[PDB]
């Protein structure tokens with residue numbers, strides 16, 4: 001029934017309502033609830049430097065209601081990891097590759113927490129990337145993500161030493177995108193497909209090669 005929709009430059013004309021709704025939800029959740037004060041904005045929309053033409057949004061929709069989601073951004077452009085937290089990836093280095101995208105802003109609305117949605121969101125990043133031929137995703141993440149990644153069968157490679165970021169233990173890591181990981185998650189969520197891709201076909205790797213130039 002309810003699906004996670006892939007929204008990008010090529011199809012956002014079908015999702016302008018939904019995108020605006022999600023920017024406001026990001027403000028409610030990341031700013032008001034989690035207190036990431038650096039992201040507070042007076043328009044009540046949580047929008048940063050990595051919300052632009054090249055961003056891909058994976059949003060869980062029930063009708064036109066956003067109930068969860070996350071976003072992906074190219075590592076071939078300046079990214080949050082490369083610009084804000086490069087020291088967190090000092091051991092292995094900060095990724096820069098059309099085949100590696102930075103994963104961020106993972107959220108679930110209160111009404112849908114501790115239910116089926118969470119594992120669907122985990123399957124969604126694997127499904128989208130595999131479809132696009134994206135090999136890995138990178139993230140700056142709170143260290144409590146490690147057991148969550150492991151529970152979902154994600155293959156994780158730490159990029160540097162954990163460090164305190166605004167009173168919270170944080171780290172940089174890559175996740176290997178795997179057909180094997182996805183197949184198990186499809187079995188667990190009881191659905192052969194969780195990502196809906198309406199409108200024109202997105203070629204993410206081509207777009208990342210372009211903005212790399």
Ligand SMILES: CC(C)CC(=O)N[C@@H](CCSC[C@H]1O[C@@H](n2cnc3c(N)ncnc32)[C@H](O)[C@@H]1O)C(=O)O
Nearest residue numbers: 036038048080084103104105106139140141142166
């Ligand atoms: C996808 C999931 C596994 C990991 C995840 O959701 N990762 C999150 C970041 C987890 S770390 C939380 C800290 O990052 C700061 N932060 C977030 N965006 C920023 C920005 N644009 N500039 C400066 N600081 C920023 C914010 O103020 C917190 O202190 C994300 O990338 O959206």
Ligand SMILES: Nc1ncnc2[nH]cnc12
Nearest residue numbers: 034142143144145148168
């Ligand atoms: N902010 C948080 N800290 C620790 N565990 C969590 N599980 C979900 N959110 C969390």
Ligand SMILES: [Cl-]
Nearest residue numbers: 023045047051
């Ligand atoms: Cl804007």
